[PDB]
Amino acid sequence: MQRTVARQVALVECVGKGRYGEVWRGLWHGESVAVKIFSSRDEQSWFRETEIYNTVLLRHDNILGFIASDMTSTQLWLITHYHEHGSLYDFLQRQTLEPHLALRLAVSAACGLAHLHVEIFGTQGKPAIAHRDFKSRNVLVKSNLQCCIADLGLAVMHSQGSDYLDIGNNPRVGTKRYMAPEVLDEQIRTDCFESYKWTDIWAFGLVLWEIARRTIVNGIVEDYRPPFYDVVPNDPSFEDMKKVVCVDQQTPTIPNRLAADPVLSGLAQMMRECWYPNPSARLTALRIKKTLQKIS
Ligand SMILES: c1ccc2c(-c3cnn4cc(-c5ccc(N6CCNCC6)cc5)cnc34)ccnc2c1
């Protein structure tokens, strides 16, 4: 029972606030936990995330660990492992990355996404899962400087066995800054599971860029900026993104000094292969994972 794990947790510090609700650092029997208190406008994300975490055997180093879910005037809680560095967004804000570290975050993030995407058969297996809101804010950085993916509120699942896409009822859509061209065009086939995987991949490419920008080479490193920082305002409208990504056919600038290296020459090419306009031309998460370790 998750009931009393919510009852004993003491809330100590609010480490995040937004339209999704709030995230707090909490103490439970000496150890630190994260407690996400959802906003009224995002109740359906709590439901979907509660269903998936209770229903799917998902535990993995590179996926945020689940502890409990509670309905504790009305308020919905999700209690999980706590990670001090916060999100990849937060980490990339303050820290610069040695090439080795850039690859470590990149590979571990790719492990998380591959694990989500790939169906594992058998009693201890899991259906194929697509995230649908992959972004640097929804990836945490652990103590060992490896990533793990969070926020399954919009996830969609599918088995090879039964072809009907398990979709929730959430009105929420993907974060606009990260939406693929086919989502902004509304040309995506919403009854095909592979489509949703291909939008995760697009978004993944954008996260690589964010890591790349913050990586040290020849003692050059840029300050943190989000993807498309040079073409859209802070909370880009769908229409702002539609114009940039579909009409103007823009993709983030690949550092014009991205190819003057061995280990970070490939990252540039891999970035390109997440951003192909035709979704089926894109690399799969498994192929990205493999390439990443293939080059260590
Ligand atoms: C998406 C992402 C995360 C979660 C989480 C979640 C789990 N852990 N965690 C930690 C932070 C966090 C901690 C500390 C900091 N700082 C300390 C270092 N300096 C920068 C500010 C910043 C951020 C935020 N969210 C979470 C729980 C539930 N749903 C999620 C959905």
Q: How close is the Cα of 243 to the center of ligand 1, in Å?
A: 32
Give catalytic residue positions: 133
Angle, CA of 20, 246 and 134, to the nearest 5°: 30
Tokens coding 90? 């937060």
85 and 142 Cβ atoms separated by less than 8 Å: yes
| Resolution (Å) of this entry | 2.7
Instruction: Quote the CA–CA distance of 105 and 204 in Å, as a whole number.
Output: 12
Instruction: Quote the CA–CA distance of 172 and 179 in Å, as a whole number.
Output: 13
Which residue's CA is the closest to the ligand 1 atom numbered 6?
Answer: 34
Q: From the CB of residue 13, how many other CB atoms can be counted at a distance below 10 Å?
A: 10
Q: What are the helix and strand counts (H, E) for the chain?
A: 9, 9
Instruction: Quote the CA–CA distance of 255 and 164 in Å, as a whole number.
Output: 42
E strand map for the chain: 10-18, 21-28, 31-38, 66-71, 76-81, 128-130, 139-141, 147-149, 156-158
Q: Which one-letter DSSP state was computed for residue 263?
A: T
Q: Report the structure determination method.
A: X-ray
Nearest 10 degrees: Cα torsion 170, 106, 236, 22: 50
Decide: 50 in ligand 1 pocket, CB within 6 A.
no
Q: By CB neighbour count within 10 A (0-12 exposed, 13-18 middle, 19+ buried), where does 291 fall? A: middle
Q: How close is the Cα of 205 to the center of ligand 1, in Å?
A: 22
What domains does the chain contain, in order, with CATH numbers?
1-84 (3.30.200.20), 85-296 (1.10.510.10)
191 and 158 Cβ atoms separated by less than 8 Å: no
Tokens coding 48? 């979907």
